[PDB]
RNA sequence: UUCAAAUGAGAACUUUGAAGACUGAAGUGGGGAAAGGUUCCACGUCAACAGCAGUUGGACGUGGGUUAGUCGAUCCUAAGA
RNA sequence: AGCUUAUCACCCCGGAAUUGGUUUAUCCGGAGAUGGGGUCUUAUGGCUGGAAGAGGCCAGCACCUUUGCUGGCUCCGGUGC
RNA sequence: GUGAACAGCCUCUAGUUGAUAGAAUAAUGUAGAUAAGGGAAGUCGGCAAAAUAGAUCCGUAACUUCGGGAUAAGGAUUGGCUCUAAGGGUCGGGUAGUGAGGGCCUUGGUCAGACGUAGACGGCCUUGGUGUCGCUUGCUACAAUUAACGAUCAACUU
RNA sequence: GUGAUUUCGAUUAACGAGAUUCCCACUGUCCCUAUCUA
C-alpha cells in the first residue's frame, strides 16, 4: 500500500499537520480504500485515523524562574550583560517620576492644599529636578507651607 | 518493585519528541485487561459475561 | 442587517410588498445573572436588508406571532 | 460569600461491578483535599459524604471540578485503576466513573 | 539514523507504525512578483533518466483540474515615447 | 449597519502681574489666558444587529452498510519602558 | 527561554530526515585541540596560534582644531541563598442640622394581566426599611493649612 | 591651479583592511617533539 494521499487528506481534514495524524498500521487495506475526504472523515470518526496531541512545551521552569526574579534573585553583576541604560532607560525613569510629580501637584492645587503661586513655584522646581520622589515633594510642601505661615505671622 | 516501575515508565515514555497517545482514542483488549485484574486480585465473572 | 425597535414599524415592514419570508429564532439567555429566560428574534427578509426585532417577553412574542400576516412564510429556528 | 458548590460523583458502574471502594474513595478525598494549602483543614468549609453510589462534595472555599478530577485520578493511579477507569462529566459539576473502550477480540 | 510490519520476483532507499535526530519563526514553515508551462491531482507503469538502487518520481502512458460587478488587468498620468 | 465614542480645532460668558496655564521635550495668553459651559472630524474603541442557527470543545447513540441522530458547554477578568 | 538584542544555543506550531552504502581504523593529509622546562633562541619578516573580551564601581597620560584622545593605561567585583531599604496607581470628606427625589420597596394597603390546581412581570404611593440609618441637591457650622492618613490594586528595577 | 584647519616651504589634532622600528603580555615559531577527536 501507499497511503501518502491518505495521510495528506487526513492532515487537511483534521486541520493539523501531517506530523500529527496517526494511521492505524492494522487497518492498512481499509485506509487504502479511502480515496475521498468523506471516507477520511468516516475513518476519523470511527478511530482508524486519530489526531495526535501536541508535543508539550511546559512553562513550569520559566514561571519558577520568573517568581524567583520577582522575589529578587538572579539579579547580580555576574548576571547583567547589557548596560544599565540598555536594561532600563533613564529617560523612561525620568518621564515616570516627572509625571508622578506633576500629577501630585495638580491634585493638591485642585484640592486647595496649595495656591496657584506655590503650585507654579513647585512646578518649575519639579521640572528642574528638585524633588527625588513623591515623599520628598510632599515633605517639602509641608515645610514650605510652615515657612509661609511663620512668615505671615511674623509680618502680622 | 518501584525501581522496576521506574524502568517500565522510562521505556514507555518519551516526551522530548512526541506526546503519549490518549487512552480515550486508543482501545485495549481482554488480554490487556484480565491479566492486570488478576495481578491486582479481583473477580472476573462480570467482565467475562460482558 | 438592521435592528428595528418599533412594533408598528415592524408590522408595516412585515406587510411591505417585497417581503415574503420571516424567521422566528429562540435564544436561552440570562437577565442580570438571573434565571434562564427566553428571547425571540423576528427576522423579516427584505430585498435589501434583513430586519431583526428582539423581544425578551415570551407572551408578547407569542401574541405577535399570532398577529403576523398569513401569507408571510415563517421559518421556525 | 458562602455559596455551597456541590459536586456529585456517580461511581455506580465500578461499584456494581464490585471492584471499586466508595469507602476508600471518600477516605482518600478527606485525607488528601488541600484547603488553604494543607490537608486536614477541611472542617466547616469542605464536606464529603457517601451514599453508596454517589459521593457528594459540598465545598465553599476554592474547590473545582478540575481539582476533583485531579484527586480522583491520583486515587485511581494509586490503586492501579487508571487503565480501566475513566472520570467523565455528564452534566456540569456532575461526574461519573466509567470504563475505557474495550473491543471484543473474537 | 534505527526496529518491525505491509507491498512486491526482488526493499539500506516505497508505505505505515515505533524510536532517535534536525531546520528552530533573519526557518528545511506559510504566500506572492517575475520566470517556467502542466511541473498540479489520480490511476497505471519502470525501456531510458533522477551519476548506488528503486516497487519511488517534477520520469513514461492515460485522464481529470484553473468558475469573479467587488481580486488584478482594463481607466489615469510619470520619466519617456 | 444603527447608536455612541477624541486629541486637535472652533464658539459663548469673563477680563488676567503676586503673571498664570502647561509638555518627556517650553511653549501659550488684551490678536482675549486661567476658568465654566458648549460645537465639530469618527482614526479608534464600546453596545447591539449580522450571530450562533456558524465555528470550537466534550458526552451519550445505532450498525455488513455508499451512514445519520441526541444532548451539554462555548463564561468572567488582569497586566506591561 | 537565556540574553542589551531579528546574535549564538535549546524548545513549541509546521516541515524534513535528503546527500551511494557496508567493513576496518597504518602512516600521511585536512579540520579541531592539549602539553613539562624555557619563552622569539625560530623566520627575509612574531606569519599563524595564544593571550584580551560582558557588565558595575574606581581611575585615566602626552597631545588637541577644546569638539576629542578614551573602552586611553591601570585596579577591585560578578554564583547561590535569606533578608533590609527605596522607587507607584485608583478611590476615599464629614455629621450637628432641616425636608423632598431614584430603584426588586421584608412584612401590610386600593386599582389591576393573555396563554398552558398555578398565575410572574407589569401602568400608582410611603414619614419605613436594605431620636426614625440613607444614595441625591440648597445651605449655617474647623469644608484640607494632619488626606502629614486610610481602604484597595499591580509591575519589575535599584 | 591648489586641495581640511592652524601656526611658524615647514608644522598640525582626529581617522586609516596604508608603511617602518621597538616594548609588555602571550605563546608548540622554536629547543623538540608527543598525544587525542572527526
UniProtKB/Swiss-Prot annotation, chain A:
<dbReference type="GO" id="GO:0022625">
    <property type="term" value="C:cytosolic large ribosomal subunit"/>
</dbReference>
<dbReference type="GO" id="GO:0003723">
    <property type="term" value="F:RNA binding"/>
</dbReference>
<keyword id="KW-1017">Isopeptide bond</keyword>
<keyword id="KW-0963">Cytoplasm</keyword>
<feature type="compositionally biased region" description="Basic residues">
    <location>
        <begin position="58"/>
        <end position="67"/>
    </location>
</feature>
<comment type="subunit">
    <text>Component of the large ribosomal subunit (LSU). Mature yeast ribosomes consist of a small (40S) and a large (60S) subunit. The 40S small subunit contains 1 molecule of ribosomal RNA (18S rRNA) and 33 different proteins (encoded by 57 genes). The large 60S subunit contains 3 rRNA molecules (25S, 5.8S and 5S rRNA) and 46 different proteins (encoded by 81 genes). eL19 lies in close proximity to the binding site for eukaryotic initiation factor eIF4G.</text>
</comment>
<dbReference type="GO" id="GO:0005829">
    <property type="term" value="C:cytosol"/>
</dbReference>
<protein>
    <recommendedName>
        <fullName>Large ribosomal subunit protein eL19A</fullName>
    </recommendedName>
</protein>
<feature type="cross-link" description="Glycyl lysine isopeptide (Lys-Gly) (interchain with G-Cter in ubiquitin)">
    <location>
        <position position="59"/>
    </location>
</feature>
<keyword id="KW-0687">Ribonucleoprotein</keyword>
<feature type="modified residue" description="Phosphoserine">
    <location>
        <position position="36"/>
    </location>
</feature>
<dbReference type="GO" id="GO:0002181">
    <property type="term" value="P:cytoplasmic translation"/>
</dbReference>
Curated annotation (Swiss-Prot), chain B:
<protein>
    <recommendedName>
        <fullName>Nucleolar GTP-binding protein 1</fullName>
    </recommendedName>
</protein>
<comment type="function">
    <text>Involved in the biogenesis of the 60S ribosomal subunit.</text>
</comment>
<comment type="similarity">
    <text>Belongs to the TRAFAC class OBG-HflX-like GTPase superfamily. OBG GTPase family. NOG subfamily.</text>
</comment>
<comment type="subunit">
    <text>Associated with nucleolar and cytoplasmic pre-60S particles. Directly interacts with RLP24.</text>
</comment>
UniProtKB/Swiss-Prot annotation, chain C:
<comment type="function">
    <text>Component of the ribosome, a large ribonucleoprotein complex responsible for the synthesis of proteins in the cell. The small ribosomal subunit (SSU) binds messenger RNAs (mRNAs) and translates the encoded message by selecting cognate aminoacyl-transfer RNA (tRNA) molecules. The large subunit (LSU) contains the ribosomal catalytic site termed the peptidyl transferase center (PTC), which catalyzes the formation of peptide bonds, thereby polymerizing the amino acids delivered by tRNAs into a polypeptide chain.</text>
</comment>
<dbReference type="InterPro" id="IPR038464">
    <property type="entry name" value="Ribosomal_eL38_sf"/>
</dbReference>
<keyword id="KW-0963">Cytoplasm</keyword>
<comment type="subunit">
    <text>Component of the large ribosomal subunit (LSU). Mature yeast ribosomes consist of a small (40S) and a large (60S) subunit. The 40S small subunit contains 1 molecule of ribosomal RNA (18S rRNA) and 33 different proteins (encoded by 57 genes). The large 60S subunit contains 3 rRNA molecules (25S, 5.8S and 5S rRNA) and 46 different proteins (encoded by 81 genes).</text>
</comment>
<comment type="similarity">
    <text>Belongs to the eukaryotic ribosomal protein eL38 family.</text>
</comment>
<dbReference type="GO" id="GO:0002181">
    <property type="term" value="P:cytoplasmic translation"/>
</dbReference>
<dbReference type="Pfam" id="PF01781">
    <property type="entry name" value="Ribosomal_L38e"/>
</dbReference>
<dbReference type="GO" id="GO:0005829">
    <property type="term" value="C:cytosol"/>
</dbReference>
<dbReference type="GO" id="GO:0005737">
    <property type="term" value="C:cytoplasm"/>
</dbReference>
<dbReference type="InterPro" id="IPR002675">
    <property type="entry name" value="Ribosomal_eL38"/>
</dbReference>
<dbReference type="GO" id="GO:0003735">
    <property type="term" value="F:structural constituent of ribosome"/>
</dbReference>
<keyword id="KW-0687">Ribonucleoprotein</keyword>
From Swiss-Prot, chain D:
<dbReference type="GO" id="GO:0002181">
    <property type="term" value="P:cytoplasmic translation"/>
</dbReference>
<keyword id="KW-0689">Ribosomal protein</keyword>
<protein>
    <recommendedName>
        <fullName>Large ribosomal subunit protein eL22A</fullName>
    </recommendedName>
</protein>
<dbReference type="InterPro" id="IPR038526">
    <property type="entry name" value="Ribosomal_eL22_sf"/>
</dbReference>
<dbReference type="GO" id="GO:0022625">
    <property type="term" value="C:cytosolic large ribosomal subunit"/>
</dbReference>
<comment type="subunit">
    <text>Component of the large ribosomal subunit (LSU). Mature yeast ribosomes consist of a small (40S) and a large (60S) subunit. The 40S small subunit contains 1 molecule of ribosomal RNA (18S rRNA) and 33 different proteins (encoded by 57 genes). The large 60S subunit contains 3 rRNA molecules (25S, 5.8S and 5S rRNA) and 46 different proteins (encoded by 81 genes).</text>
</comment>
<keyword id="KW-0687">Ribonucleoprotein</keyword>
<dbReference type="GO" id="GO:0003723">
    <property type="term" value="F:RNA binding"/>
</dbReference>
<dbReference type="InterPro" id="IPR002671">
    <property type="entry name" value="Ribosomal_eL22"/>
</dbReference>
<dbReference type="GO" id="GO:0003735">
    <property type="term" value="F:structural constituent of ribosome"/>
</dbReference>
<comment type="function">
    <text>Component of the ribosome, a large ribonucleoprotein complex responsible for the synthesis of proteins in the cell. The small ribosomal subunit (SSU) binds messenger RNAs (mRNAs) and translates the encoded message by selecting cognate aminoacyl-transfer RNA (tRNA) molecules. The large subunit (LSU) contains the ribosomal catalytic site termed the peptidyl transferase center (PTC), which catalyzes the formation of peptide bonds, thereby polymerizing the amino acids delivered by tRNAs into a polypeptide chain.</text>
</comment>
<comment type="similarity">
    <text>Belongs to the eukaryotic ribosomal protein eL22 family.</text>
</comment>
Amino acid at each position: 500500500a501507499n497511503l501518502r494521499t491518505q495521510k495528506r487528506l487526513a492532515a487537511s481534514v483534521v486541520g493539523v499537520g501531517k506530523r500529527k495524524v496517526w494511521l492505524d498500521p492494522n487497518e492498512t487495506s481499509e485506509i487504502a480504500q479511502a480515496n475521498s475526504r468523506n471516507a477520511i472523515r468516516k475513518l476519523v470518526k470511527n478511530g482508524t485515523i486519530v489526531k495526535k496531541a501536541v508535543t508539550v512545551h511546559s512553562k513550569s521552569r520559566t514561571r519558577a524562574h520568573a517568581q524567583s526574579k520577582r522575589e529578587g534573585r538572579h539579579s547580580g553583576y555576574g548576571k547583567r550583560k547589557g548596560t544599565r541604560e540598555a536594561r532600563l532607560p533613564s529617560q523612561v525613569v525620568w518621564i515616570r517620576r516627572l509625571r508622578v510629580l506633576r500629577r501630585l501637584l495638580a491634585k493638591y492645587r485642585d484640592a486647595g492644599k496649595i495656591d496657584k503661586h506655590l503650585y507654579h513655584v513647585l512646578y518649575k522646581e519639579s521640572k528642574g529636578n528638585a524633588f527625588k520622589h513623591k515623599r520628598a515633594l510632599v515633605e517639602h510642601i509641608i515645610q514650605a507651607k510652615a515657612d509661609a505661615q511663620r512668615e505671615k505671622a511674623l509680618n502680622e | 518493585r518501584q525501581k522496576t516501575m521506574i524502568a517500565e515508565a522510562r521505556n514507555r515514555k518519551s516526551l522530548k519528541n512526541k506526546a503519549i497517545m490518549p487512552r480515550s482514542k486508543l482501545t485495549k483488549s481482554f488480554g490487556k485487561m484480565e491479566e492486570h485484574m488478576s495481578t491486582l486480585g479481583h473477580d472476573m465473572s462480570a467482565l467475562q459475561d460482558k | 442587517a438592521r435592528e428595528i425597535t418599533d412594533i408598528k414599524q415592524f408590522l408595516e415592514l412585515t406587510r411591505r410588498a417585497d417581503v415574503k419570508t420571516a424567521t422566528v429564532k429562540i435564544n436561552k439567555k440570562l437577565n442580570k445573572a438571573g434565571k434562564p429566560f427566553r428571547q425571540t428574534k423576528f427576522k423579516v427578509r427584505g430585498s435589501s436588508s434583513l430586519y431583526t426585532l428582539v423581544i425578551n417577553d415570551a407572551g408578547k412574542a407569542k401574541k405577535l406571532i399570532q398577529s403576523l400576516p398569513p401569507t408571510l412564510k415563517v421559518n421556525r429556528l | 460569600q458562602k455559596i455551597a458548590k456541590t459536586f456529585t460523583v456517580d461511581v455506580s458502574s465500578p461499584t456494581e461491578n464490585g471492584v471499586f471502594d466508595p469507602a476508600s474513595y471518600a477516605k482518600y478525598l478527606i485525607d488528601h483535599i488541600k484547603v488553604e494549602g494543607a490537608v486536614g483543614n477541611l472542617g466547616n468549609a469542605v464536606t464529603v459524604t457517601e451514599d453508596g453510589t454517589v459521593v457528594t462534595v459540598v465545598s465553599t472555599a476554592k474547590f473545582s471540578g478540575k481539582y476533583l478530577k485531579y484527586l480522583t485520578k491520583k486515587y485511581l493511579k494509586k490503586n492501579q485503576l487508571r487503565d480501566w477507569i475513566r472520570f467523565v462529566s455528564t452534566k456540569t459539576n456532575e461526574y461519573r466513573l466509567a470504563f475505557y473502550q474495550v473491543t471484543p477480540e473474537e
